[PDB]
């Protein structure tokens with residue numbers, strides 16, 4: 001291995017590529033490499049890399065469109081990072097027609113002297129819409145969506161009601177006024193909340209979680225497919241769930257006024273919002289109400305109709321609000337640190353675009369879940385039990401250096417010395433809030449942050465300013481949370497003197513070697529789901545702008561490159577490119593650290609965060625890209 005690197009090939013539509021381990025792959029090297037290959041590589045000069053061998057080749061389902069040249073069929077990949085055509089012999093056409101979207105299995109990889117060859121294994125057709133975009137995204141990103149037969153068989157024997165035999169031995173919380181608060185369109189209720197004032201100060205908080213590990217035991221078909229998926233995937237009006245709906249919307253979901261098994265984190269909180277204690281136990285509950293964020297917020301604002309309808313719960317909802325206010329302040333004391341809302345028509349296409357409104361009902365659930373997440377992480381960390389922590393690393397030295405150089409030119413500084421802490425960034429964010437360039441500085445700060453991941457090494461969570469954090473409260477839709485419930489049940493039994501590695505209600509002890517693999521896989525699945533949903537969102541946004549060619553929009557420069565700058569349209573969350581060739585004729589200089597394109601003769605300056613107006617010049621539906629002209 002010295003000195004090799006295992007990495008994944010990332011193609012580029014222009015013929016060259018990259019190795020994700022940042023290494024560059026020449027155009028000639030990419031004649032035998034395929035976007036998605038897993039390889040062993042060696043570094044060269046400047047940083048270029050040479051491929052030693054292909055460890056896991058990319059052969060799986062390639063989505064593209066079918067055409068013919070001189071009677072020879074071929075497929076143009078939909079993902080232009082697969083920057084080659086695929087010949088299809090005439091007996092492997094499966095009855096595809098010109099322009100149809102098809103799915104290909106490679107039979108010959110491309111080489112320097114020959115083109116790739118494949119066979120069409122599925123024909124999707126020419127009816128391009130939201131359903132088609134989802135179908136393409138599932139296949140391109142290899143998201144599992146077909147239920148294995150063994151999963152269907154495992155689930156066939158499930159009763160609709162929890163049997164009394166399952167409730168025996170559990171803490172009875174059915175008289176506790178636990179409630180669920182979720183979006184109107186949600187059907188998989190992972191969590192329920194209740195809190196009381198604590199005698200002498202503070203609060204006692206119950207966070208009750210769907211007891212997924214009771215229903216999904218290790219190595220069963222349900223477990224193997226849940227790990228395979230890694231997470232639920234959320235498309236427009238359509239969920240690809242990690243678990244079959246009979247569990248995720250039924251027995252696991254904490255539905256109203258029905259007895260349900262749950263795993264409970266019961267916590268004490270000080271009058272200043274500090275977690276002072278926690279315990280975990282299996283219980284049975286009965287949700288007193290299925291509420292929405294909108295209803296709860298209106299209740300807290302004083303809405304008469306809702307406070308009459310839910311009068312027996314109003315005091316309990318107000319107490320969660322009181323607790324939240326102090327938890328929010330505790331997050332501030334700790335070190336602290338806008339989204340599109342698609343309105344769809346009946347055909348799952350965008351009718352209009354709104355800005356999501358986030359209110360105290362969203363945030364009180366968020367802070368309650370964070371407390372349970374902290375409690376679960378501290379529980380497994382103190383026990384030295386192999387588990388996935390939800391970690392968020394410090395910003396890179398290079399990102400801090402570039403950020404401080406941008407700040408210094410403005411007379412600003414990032415406090416905290418050479419290794420600033422979350423509170424230092426939060427202090428800087430406060431200081432710049434009212435500046436005209438606050439959005440530019442916030443964007444630069446957030447873009448210096450690393451991406452959060454699942455990892456069995458607890459390196460802390462920078463963004464939340466937490467020493468120990470782990471995802472515990474959504475085991476219906478995240479595989480890491482499922483494994484954490486298993487570890488907690490295993491530890492609870494061990495504290496009672498139990499000596500086995502499993503528990504009759506679903507506990508399980510994992511090895512550190514398993515957890516290393518699981519962290520990489522589950523972090524992969526999280527990113528994979530995000531890229532697929534973004535693909536579909538890109539298609540919907542381009543479809544929405546198709547009839548806007550020629551029209552003018554206000555926007556903000558969202559990224560600057562040597563070939564132009566991208567602009568995000570105000571209130572629409574839609575991006576497009578102002579190419580440098582569309583600007584006034586000049587010699588344009590690119591400042592990378594300043595994120596600036598400067599015209600030498602004109603003195604004109606287009607910088608990240610600048611407010612502009614752009615005209616929609618073109619919408620390319622095949623590439624899902626929009627072209628702008630400035631002014």
Ligand SMILES: [Mg+2]
Pocket residue numbers: 181182188189190191
């Ligand atoms: Mg929920």
